[PDB]
Amino acid sequence: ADKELKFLVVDDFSTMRRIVRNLLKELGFNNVEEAEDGVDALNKLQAGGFGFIISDWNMPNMDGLELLKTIRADSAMSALPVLMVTAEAKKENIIAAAQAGASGYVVKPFTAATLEEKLNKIFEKLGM
Q: Can you tell me which residues bind Mg(2+)?
């Protein structure tokens, strides 16, 4: 993976976005932009050049699953890796997200080591 890959961190909590941005930084990924909910993220992804999405499952207006489904249906972005973040793993949640095309899932709070493993896994799975 290019350390310059442009990440989009999506969450309605500012502080969780700042945590994620800081974890990424710690791994050498400094190209990060933020969005507050699903529609805000889609507005931003329009501009182009993003290479990886980290989205929270639970967001108002357009939740994680809906944003993932919109990204997967879009011819120009359908291959973008999407890591879903949740506060609690639920079997039906994991299945719905996988079937909708999620690249992986992580339960918060998490550390840099955990995030690193998740990223490495996705890059491995996608051959990046």
A: 11-12, 56, 58
